[PDB]
Design a protein around this ligand. Structure first.
Ligand SMILES: [Cu+]
Length: 153
């Protein structure tokens, strides 16, 4: 059982977007994704969001996360979920939209297993305006403090 992860979005002078995206292991080799966001600038949405390949640095420069996490050469536009990049959550499941957005879904492509080529731990998530401008971003970190088979959290 691989550990749960979370991306925590914080409000700054650059963006009012705040909230969380949680990743928890679920049944049948899937990962449950829970999105809970507010402060979105609705009129410039809907908002693509993706797992990107590099961490958000201390400067909070969303550009420094570089490209989408795409370990299998995926295409931006697809006729089936599997043709999307692994990190292309919005392409597969829908863009964030509105001023507030709360949703839950399963993704069977991302992995919580550090030994998987689809592992998303240590990466980042970027939320974009509809035109591609990066609005806010967050590192993907551990959801729980305490781990191991003899521990509690
Ligand atoms: Cu992105």
């Amino acid at each position: 059982v691989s550990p749960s992860l979370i991306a925590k979005f914080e409000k700054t002078s650059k963006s009012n977007i705040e909230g969380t995206i949680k990743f928890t292991p679920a049944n049948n080799g899937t990962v449950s994704v829970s999105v809970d966001l507010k402060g979105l600038p609705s009129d410039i949405g809907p908002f693509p969001y993706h797992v990107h390949e590099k961490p958000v640095p201390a400067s909070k420069n969303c550009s420094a996360t570089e490209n989408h996490f795409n370990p299998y050469n995926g295409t931006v536009r697809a006729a089936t979920p599997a043709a999307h990049e692994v990190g292309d959550l919005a392409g597969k499941h829908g863009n964030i939209m509105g001023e507030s957005y709360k949703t839950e879904y399963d993704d069977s492509y991302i992995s919580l297993n550090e030994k998987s080529r689809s592992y998303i731990g240590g990466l980042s998530i970027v939320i974009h305006a509809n035109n591609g401008t990066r609005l806010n971003c967050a590192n993907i970190t551990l959801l729980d403090e305490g781990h191991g088979n003899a521990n509690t959290t």
